[PDB]
Amino acid sequence: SYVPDDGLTAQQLFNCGDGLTYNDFLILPGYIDFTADQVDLTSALTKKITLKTPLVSSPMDTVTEAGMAIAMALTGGIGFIHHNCTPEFQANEVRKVKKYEQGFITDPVVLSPKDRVRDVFEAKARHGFCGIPITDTGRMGSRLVGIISSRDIDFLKEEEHDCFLEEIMTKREDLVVAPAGITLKEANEILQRSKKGKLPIVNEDDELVAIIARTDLKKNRDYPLASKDAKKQLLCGAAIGTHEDDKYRLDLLAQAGVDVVVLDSSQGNSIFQINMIKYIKDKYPNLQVIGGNVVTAAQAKNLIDAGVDALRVGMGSGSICITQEVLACGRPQATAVYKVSEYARRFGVPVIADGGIQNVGHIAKALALGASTVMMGSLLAATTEAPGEYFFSDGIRLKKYRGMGSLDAMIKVAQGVSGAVQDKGSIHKFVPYLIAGIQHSCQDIGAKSLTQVRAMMYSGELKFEKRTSSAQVEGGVHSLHSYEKRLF
């Protein structure tokens, strides 16, 4: 049709030479012909594995751990588990997320039938729950004996008599155990016909493996966009460094079965990282690596030729970075996502933007510039399943948040800062707001899918416009006496 040329296409915008950031330009709207929910924001992470949602956490010690891993796994994304710990620790928590059995609750504690009841008295307050299964030797690899509960050991004043648990609970006579490999709703049917509040599962050789809790099945919400692999375990990655001893990390991680790894550094164009891609891609051909950090097309080329499968674009634009204040490096990363993804689409390589995000607008402007998925570090901090725990300050509930180069994590130099950010709640309540943010943004842009909003950007029919500082003071909240900003 006619389509007047009001606006700037992307190669007209990012060739003016100025360093543009996210709150420096914005996207012009266009024709819309569909409703809000039916845009499918399927995005890719690497050359093989894809996602339902384009969100992904950052690998720091203060944002992502097993809880963040399971959570962002089941809500569509992936989380990457930091390497600020011992290798067996990171292997242990990636094993914790990798099985997880979708709600069939994992890592039960276990006692021996010779054991006393002050131990379950202290373990009830150490952990929180009450129903514990019992085997012969009191360990997972033994024949089953029975189960206990707080409906079994409450009001007995004989606890110092070296109590023997055979003389207390129900061994096999009232016991019901489903056959193994049973699904969610069928085992739930077994529970709700059983009139019994706790269900062991055994194999053909009477070995306890997994376990449920009854009260979770009242709100067993199915997560329809769950991003789980060919053998139906959750997609979950990790990140390891570049220093030579991390080989003993990543081989343990591949024993644990990590499927994507991130080679994080301040800037990724080293001989160290290139030689380690050459070390990985002949030992683990099915494992896929994430290179980074790159900001320019030169260090993008010098990684993708080595065999890396996705770039992690953006240094120096963190919420907790001071490496532009110290190392005088980096670039404003809204230019970096375009000038790296423009080189990255040439070879079929997705790119990952990290840092600079503090709202759901910036992730839309990021992945409309060629970014396939968006790594968020501070916006997903201060949640329920972020590691660490809350502490009130000035009356505001917050929990600490700290950078990898900040020497409270590690003579050396400092590349980060330590601090704290106010709370957000659990992300099952938070990231569907982010998905709805992408969803309404790609609504008003005018594309039914993120793949074709990037196709509209590289074609030219999606057009941007520069924005000045006196327009940025006008874009936000202005000319009010006191406003209260509630996002959802």
Ligand X SMILES: Nc1ncnc2c1ncn2[C@@H]1O[C@H](COP(=O)(O)OP(=O)(O)OP(=O)(O)O)[C@@H](O)[C@H]1O
Ligand Y SMILES: O=c1[nH]cnc2c1ncn2[C@@H]1O[C@H](COP(=O)(O)O)[C@@H](O)[C@H]1O
Ligand Z SMILES: Nc1nc2c(ncn2[C@@H]2O[C@H](COP(=O)(O)OP(=O)(O)OP(=O)(O)O)[C@@H](O)[C@H]2O)c(=O)[nH]1
Site string for ligand Z, 223-262 (x = CB under 6 A): -----x---x------------------------------
Give CA–CA dist 427/420, Å, rounded: 18
Residues taking part in catalysis: 321
Does the annotation flag 307 for ligand binding? no
261 near other proteins, rule: CB under 8 A? no
84 near other proteins, rule: CB under 8 A? no
Residue type, 181: G
Assess contact for 30 and 1: CB atoms under 8 A: no
Quick one: which of 4, 17, 128, 285 contacts ligand X (CB under 6 A)? Answer: 128
The number of beta carbons lying within 10 Å of the beta carbon of residue 286 is 7
Give CA–CA dist 3/89, Å, rounded: 57
Q: Nearest-CA neighbor of 461 among 34, 37, 27, 36?
A: 27
Give CA–CA dist 315/170, Å, rounded: 60
97 near ligand Z, rule: CB under 6 A? no
Give CA–CA dist 285/247, Å, rounded: 15
Q: Choosing among ligand Z, ligand NAD, ligand Y, none, which partner's interface includes residue 378 (Cβ < 5 to 8 Å by kind)? A: ligand Y
- What do you get for the CA distance between the two ends of the chain, in Å? 39
The count of chain residues that interact with ligand Z, using the rule CB under 6 A, is: 24
Does the annotation flag 475 for ligand binding? yes
Q: Choosing among ligand Z, ligand NAD, ligand Y, none, which partner's interface includes residue 233 (Cβ < 5 to 8 Å by kind)? A: none
Nearer to ligand Z by C-beta: 149 or 242? 149
Site string for ligand Y, 192-231 (x = CB under 6 A): ----------------------------------------
The strand pair at 310-313 and 288-294 is best described as parallel
Which whole-number Å values give the CA distances from 195 to 175, 176, 187, 288, in the listed order? 11, 10, 13, 47
What six digits make up the tokens of 151?
């409906």
Contact positions toward its own copies, by CB under 8 A?
A: 151-152, 154-155, 189, 191-193, 195, 197, 217-218, 221, 392-398, 422, 484, 486
Q: Choosing among its own copies, ligand Y, ligand NAD, none, which partner's interface includes residue 237 (Cβ < 5 to 8 Å by kind)? A: none
340 near ligand NAD, rule: CB under 6 A? no
Does the annotation flag 266 for ligand binding? yes
Nearer to its own copies by C-beta: 328 or 487? 487
48 near other proteins, rule: CB under 8 A? yes
41 near ligand X, rule: CB under 6 A? no
Give CA–CA dist 277/343, Å, rounded: 19
Q: Choosing among ligand Y, ligand NAD, ligand Z, none, which partner's interface includes residue 243 (Cβ < 5 to 8 Å by kind)? A: ligand NAD
The number of beta carbons lying within 10 Å of the beta carbon of residue 2 is 4
CB of 170 vs ligand X, minimal distance in Å: 4
The 10 Å CB-count burial string (b at 16+, else e) for 197-231 is ebbbbbeeeeebebbbbeeebeeeeeeebebeeee
108 near ligand Z, rule: CB under 6 A? yes
311 near ligand NAD, rule: CB under 6 A? no
Nearer to ligand NAD by C-beta: 3 or 328? 328
Nearer to other proteins by C-beta: 47 or 397? 47
149 near ligand X, rule: CB under 6 A? yes
Quick one: which of 126, 243, 397, 429 contacts ligand NAD (CB under 6 A)? Answer: 243
Please list every residue from 451 through 470 that binds other proteins, using CB under 8 A: 451-452, 454-455, 458
Does the annotation flag 79 for ligand binding? no
Give how far the C-alpha of residue 384 lies from the chain's centroid of Cα atoms, to the nearest Å: 13
Assess contact for 59 and 82: CB atoms under 8 A: yes
439 near other proteins, rule: CB under 8 A? no
Q: Choosing among ligand Y, ligand NAD, other proteins, none, which partner's interface includes residue 319 (Cβ < 5 to 8 Å by kind)? A: ligand Y
376 near ligand Y, rule: CB under 6 A? yes
Q: Choosing among ligand Y, its own copies, ligand Z, none, which partner's interface includes residue 14 (Cβ < 5 to 8 Å by kind)? A: none
Chain contacts with ligand Y (rule: CB under 6 A): 58, 60, 318-321, 323, 354-357, 375-379, 403-406, 415-416
Chain contacts with ligand Z (rule: CB under 6 A): 99-103, 105, 108-109, 129-131, 149-150, 184-185, 188, 197, 211, 213, 215-216, 220, 228, 232
Chain contacts with ligand NAD (rule: CB under 6 A): 241-244, 264-266, 270, 272, 293, 314-316, 318, 321, 323, 354-355, 404-405, 415
Binding positions for NAD(+) are 264-266, 314-316
Chain contacts with other proteins (rule: CB under 8 A): 42-50, 345-346, 348, 350, 372, 451-452, 454-455, 458
